[PDB]
Structures are given as C-alpha cells and as structure tokens.
Amino acid sequence: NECLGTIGPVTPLDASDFALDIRMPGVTPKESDTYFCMSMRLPVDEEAFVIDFKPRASMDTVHHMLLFGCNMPSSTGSYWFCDEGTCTDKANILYAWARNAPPTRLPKGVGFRVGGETGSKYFVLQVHYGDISAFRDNHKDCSGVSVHLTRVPQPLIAGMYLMMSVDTVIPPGEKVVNADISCQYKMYPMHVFAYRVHTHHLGKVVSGYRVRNGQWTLIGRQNPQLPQAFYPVEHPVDVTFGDILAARCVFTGEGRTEATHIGGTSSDEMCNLYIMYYMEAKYALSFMTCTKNVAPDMFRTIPAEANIPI
Ligand SMILES: [Cu+2]
Ligand SMILES: [Cu+2]
Ligand code: NI
Numbered sequence: 001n002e003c004l005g006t007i008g009p010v011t012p013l014d015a016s017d018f019a020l021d022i023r024m025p026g027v028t029p030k031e032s033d034t035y036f037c038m039s040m041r042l043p044v045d046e047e048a049f050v051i052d053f054k055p056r057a058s059m060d061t062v063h064h065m066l067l068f069g070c071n072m073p074s075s076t077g078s079y080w081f082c083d084e085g086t087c088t089d090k091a092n093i094l095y096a097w098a099r100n101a102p103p104t105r106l107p108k109g110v111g112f113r114v115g116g117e118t119g120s121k122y123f124v125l126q127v128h129y130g131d132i133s134a135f136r137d138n139h140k141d142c143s144g145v146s147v148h149l150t151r152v153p154q155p156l157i158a159g160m161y162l163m164m165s166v167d168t169v170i171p172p173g174e175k176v177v178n179a180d181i182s183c184q185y186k187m188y189p190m191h192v193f194a195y196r197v198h199t200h201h202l203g204k205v206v207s208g209y210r211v212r213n214g215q216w217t218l219i220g221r222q223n224p225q226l227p228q229a230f231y232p233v234e235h236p237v238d239v240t241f242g243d244i245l246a247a248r249c250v251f252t253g254e255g256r257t258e259a260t261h262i263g264g265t266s267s268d269e270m271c272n273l274y275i276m277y278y279m280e281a282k283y284a285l286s287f288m289t290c291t292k293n294v295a296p297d298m299f300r301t302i303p304a305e306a307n308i309p310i
Contacts, residue, residue: 001056003142010043013148018043020147022067022125023056025078026140029129037082039073040123044149047116050158052106052148055097062143063130064228067095069112069120084264086124092287093160093274094123095145096196098227099130107193110278111154113286123147157284158276161190161239163208163247165271166291170202170260174253179271180299181247183290188283189240194230195220198272202260204250207306208273210237211244211295216303219275223310224249230276239277244295247273248306 003026011019022040029036042048057065070087074080094112097103114120125144135141165179197206203224210217219237239245249271253260260269279285 001058001142003140009040016151018149020149021056021144022123022147023142023144024125024127026142027079028135028138028140029132032130032132034129035081035083036079036127036129037074037086038079038125042115042121042123044115046151047119048114048149048151049111049154050094050114050147051111051150051154053095053103054146055103056146057097057143058134058141060134061129061132061141062127063099064128065097065143065145066093066126067145068093068124068126069114069122070124071121073122073124082126086126091124092120096228096230097145098229101227101229103229104194104232106158107156107278109154110156110158111150112158119286153281155281156278157281157286158278159190159284159286159288161245161275161277161288161290163245163273163275163290165249165262168262168269168271170251170253170269172253172256172258177251177253179249179251180293180296181271181290182293182295182298183245184294185239185243185245186241187285187288188279189238190277190279192219192233192237192239192275192277194232194276196228196230196274197222197224198228198270198274199224199249200266200269202251202253202256202269203271204252205306205309206247206249206271206273208245208247208275209302210239211246211298212242214301216301220273221305221310230274244298245290246298246302248299248302250307
C-alpha cells in the first residue's frame with residue numbers, strides 16, 4: 001500500500017486511541033524469496049493495548065508478513081535482511097498475514113499489552129517477498145501493517161504459548177520422524193482462540209492437543225506447507241492448571257542426502273506451534289514457552305489423525 005510521505009506513521013483516532021502504520025521504507029528486492037525486516041519504537045512510554053491490525057500489502061509481491069514485539073531489534077538500521085531473525089531478545093509474535101489465507105480478527109475485548117515497564121518497546125515487521133516479477137519497473141515497496149493502539153485497559157489480554165522442538169534429528173531417507181513436545185500447564189486458565197504452525201520443507205503435519213485425565217482434545221492440526229497464517233480454533237478450548245499440552249510434528253528425510261537438525265536455515269528444520277490465547281486481565285500473563293517433552297510415554301495414546309496428512 002502507498003508510502004505515507006508527509007503525514008507520517010501516526011494517526012490520532014480519539015482522545016485515547018491512535019493508529020500506527022508500520023511499513024517498509026520504500027524497498028526494492030533484487031532476488032526471489034527475500035526477507036526484509038524493519039523496526040519501530042512505540043511513540044508512547046506508558047502501557048498500551050494492541051486491539052486491531054489491518055494489512056497494507058501488495059497483492060502481487062508480498063507472500064507473507066509477520067509482526068513481533070520485542071525490546072532489542074537485531075539491527076539499528078533502516079531495514080535489514082532477516083531470513084528468520086528479528087530480535088536479540090525474545091521476539092513475541094502478534095500477527096501473521098499470509099497470502100491465500102486471510103487473517104481472523106481479535107475477539108472484541110481482547111488486546112495485547114505493550115509498552116510501559118514490562119511490555120514490548122518495539123515492533124518488528126518481517127516481509128517475505130515471493131515472485132519479484134512485479135518489481136520489473138523498479139518501484140519502491142511500502143508494504144506493512146496498521147496497528148490500532150489504545151490506552152483503555154482491556155478486560156481480556158492476549159498472549160502466546162509457544163511449543164518448539166530443540167533436539168530433533170532427521171536421518172537422510174527416513175520415511176517418518178516424529179518431533180514430540182509436552183509440558184505441564186501451571187498458570188491461571190487460558191482460552192485458545194487461534195493457532196499457527198511452522199516447519200520448513202520436510203514437515204508433513206503439525207498437531208497440538210490439550211490432554212486432561214488422559215483425554216486428548218484437539219487445538220489445531222495443519223499442513224505446514226499450506227500458508228502459515230493464524231487459523232481460528234474450531235472450538236474455543238480452555239487450558240487449566242494440571243493439563244498437559246502436547247504437540248507432534250511429522251517429518252520425512254526423503255530427498256535429503258545428509259541428516260537434518262533444528263536450525264535457522266532452509267537446510268534445517270523447525271517444529272513450532274504458536275497457540276494464541278486470551279486470559280482474564282487480572283490473571284493474564286503475556287507469554288509461555290515449552291521446549292521439553294515431560295511425558296514422552298503419553299504419546300502412545302495420541303489420536304491417529306496426528307500421524308496422517310490433512
Ligand atoms: Cu511467505
Ligand atoms: Cu523456521
Ligand atoms: Ni471456557
């Protein structure tokens with residue numbers, strides 16, 4: 001969408017609300033599959049809540065976009081290459097826009113807390129450019145996201161539960177390799193409303209479950225070779241103190257001459273499940289992570305759907 005020029009990136013909406021436009025600074029990629037990142041410091045120091053996102057993408061050039069909150073972006077520059085980087089501290093995903101899979105709105109009453117003493121001080125925007133045939137006129141791209149911020153405290157607070165593999169090894173030619181992740185939940189209740197899967201080219205299927213008294217309840221199941229948007233949960237699912245969260249990525253090693261481990265390049269793999277939730281404001285925390293497998297034997301009773309392509 002058009003570069004903003006003289007009016008700048010901040011639009012006053014109310015005596016308590018404003019829109020912040022986070023856009024690439026007129027970039028022109030020279031190669032296919034280029035990842036550009038840029039950052040924006042929040043204009044306010046006090047606590048604010050992110051309550052809406054509007055995509056400002058070219059429907060010709062942009063393949064996907066992600067928006068993160070963090071305190072230390074990887075570069076102090078105007079823009080940089082980030083094949084998967086973003087920040088030096090923890091990059092907290094807030095929004096995904098995927099071509100051919102339209103985003104779903106935040107439920108009303110729900111917001112991410114940012115700024116203040118403990119919230120993100122920066123937004124970091126990652127834009128993935130696919131086919132660069134539309135850049136033949138050498139035009140400058142200002143694609144990005146418009147974010148609606150308010151100072152009005154929200155009754156429900158949005159957060160992310162990230163489940164990720166660390167130790168996976170996929171030997172070459174191997175028909176099937178499973179990456180299993182599991183943790184005990186020990187916070188106040190969260191309600192999952194959306195999910196995103198992330199794998200590289202070897203991933204076949206990713207599934208996430210809440211396990212309670214041995215019973216498996218589906219959160220999300222998706223082919224990671226399909227556009228990696230945040231997809232809505234079929235049915236709102238609570239996760240409560242005592243529950244186990246379990247996830248499985250199914251990989252193959254076929255077409256590879258050497259072993260494939262977890263890493264940041266296309267020659268490596270990832271097994272990431274992003275579980276987007278809301279919590280009551282007075283109970284809420286903004287992020288949780290599972291990088292372990294605390295109940296490995298539990299996976300004997302995983303539903304069969306977790307083992308076959310969607
Ligand atoms: Cu993409
Ligand atoms: Cu990755
Ligand atoms: Ni409920």
